[PDB]
Design a protein around this ligand. Structure first.
Ligand SMILES: Nc1ncnc2c1ncn2CCCCCNC(=O)c1cc(-c2ccc(F)cc2)cc(O)c1O
Ligand SMILES: [Cl-]
Ligand SMILES: [Cl-]
Ligand SMILES: [Cl-]
Ligand SMILES: [Mg+2]
Length: 214
């Protein structure tokens, strides 16, 4: 039968207003609080995300790991006209959910899905997707990939002075190599935002790591 992700999308379609991103976020968070937990960033950490996005007003954001599109809706709804989000989702079923979520929210013109693995797509961003450098990166994919993909972004010339990395789940499930690396590197200026795991009374946090150049 249907999957949890399909159930979340249907719930949104039936309990939110087309073209109203805030209603979409609220519907997802209600479903995941009342019916079934799911690994969306959630409202606690989402509020911290919102504060960061508002501070930096990025023109080009890369997201690693879309899932159902919750974080993509969260960020894209606060981007300025003409600003863009690219989100990389390796699971094709999740990619289809995310596209449909974005379509429902009316944010499809601001967001592009890149279906594939981050390590394969990151090296294509300049030539295939006409990216120069990224203003912000939201990391929310497999936790073991945060570090290697950060290093790949740098190798590929995608980071500039001031690029904001914002990493979910640095406590649960945790990203110990990434966290050690950024906090020990003179190429990053790091801030920890303590919060809670989505929909749970469990401590989690976001790490912001601002790239300083080589
Ligand atoms: N061993 C592998 N090999 C390849 N892929 C793999 C994998 N293992 C996973 N994945 C595919 C990653 C795609 C989703 C990435 N996100 C997450 O995994 C994630 C998980 C939690 C979570 C927290 C507490 C819990 F008790 C359980 C899960 C919360 C979040 O906010 C998340 O973003
Ligand atoms: Cl999410
Ligand atoms: Cl992905
Ligand atoms: Cl929450
Ligand atoms: Mg997460």
């Amino acid at each position: 039968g249907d999957t949890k992700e399909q159930r979340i999308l249907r719930y949104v379609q039936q309990n939110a207003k087309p073209g109203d991103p805030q209603s979409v976020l609220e519907a997802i968070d209600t479903y995941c609080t009342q019916k079934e937990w799911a690994m969306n960033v959630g409202d606690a950490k989402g509020q911290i995300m919102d504060a960061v996005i508002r501070e930096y007003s990025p023109s080009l954001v890369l997201e690693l790991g879309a899932y159902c599109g919750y974080s993509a809706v969260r960020m894209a709804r606060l981007l300025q006209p003409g600003a863009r989000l690219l989100t990389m989702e390796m699971n094709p079923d999740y990619a289809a959910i995310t596209q449909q979520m974005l379509n429902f929210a009316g944010l499809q013109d601001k967001v592009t899905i890149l279906n594939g693995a981050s390590q394969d797509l990151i090296p294509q961003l300049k030539k295939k997707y006409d990216v120069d450098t990224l203003d912000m990166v939201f990391l929310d994919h497999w936790k073991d990939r945060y570090l290697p993909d950060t290093l790949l972004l740098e190798k590929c010339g995608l980071l500039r002075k001031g690029t904001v990395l914002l990493a979910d789940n640095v406590i649960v499930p945790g990203t110990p190599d990434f966290l050690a690396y950024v906090r020990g590197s003179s190429s990053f200026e790091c801030t920890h935002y303590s919060s809670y795991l989505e929909y749970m009374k469990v401590v989690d946090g976001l790490e912001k790591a601002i790239y300083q150049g080589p």
